[PDB]
Design a protein around this ligand. Sequence first.
Ligand code: MG
Ligand code: MG
Length: 198
Amino acid sequence: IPYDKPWYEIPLDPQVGQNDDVEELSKEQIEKLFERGKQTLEADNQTYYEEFTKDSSQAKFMSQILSDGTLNDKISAVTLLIQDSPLHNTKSLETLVSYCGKKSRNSALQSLNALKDLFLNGLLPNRKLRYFKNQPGLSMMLNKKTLAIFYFEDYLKKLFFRVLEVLEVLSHDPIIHVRLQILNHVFDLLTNQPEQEF
RNA sequence: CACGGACCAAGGAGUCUAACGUCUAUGCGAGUGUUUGGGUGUAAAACCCAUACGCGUAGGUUGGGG
Ligand SMILES: [Mg+2]
Ligand SMILES: [Mg+2]
């Protein structure tokens, strides 16, 4: 999967675009495609990471930050790792969501602000997110590339949902400032993106 | 900047007393302390007497402040 383009704008298979009368694939057929989509995602994206590790100056300096840096520096480094290649670096996306969940209010707010900036940079579509089972033209003849893309869309929808969970728990925080900031982030997302608007 | 933080009001981790001794000030001085009692008293007082016992007593030369 190319990294130079936002992963929604990457051209899908043509078979996605003239398949509206396709028979409903059974759950096993959807499950196998969902699995095959998964293995292709944590496939070459690793090889992309292996290519990334070849640059020793780039890997070492960032690994030092990801290991020894402060929370703000780590949040930044993780945010960039997602901007450069959001599709490939599911590990950094998971890591970012993990900072949002800690007991530390200041850092969790910073991490969630970083996620909000990532979401509201156009990374999320103009349209809503689709689950893997709800993708159009879901077929056995779909290529690995498009299949990985659909799996990543399902994964990112789950990511947004767990981010909403983190918002909900934090939105009831006793501290007034935390509640106000969470409210501001919620209304920013609601105004500027369609995902989970309800 | 690095690290932590429901909210307001309060409250919030033990006592009197003894024995010996150094120094200083005051009174007296081989004395010193009374009050153990009494008198007296514009009355715990203040002023005064004894009454005992306690603790005390029982040269040579050189230098030498003066
Ligand atoms: Mg003599
Ligand atoms: Mg002489």
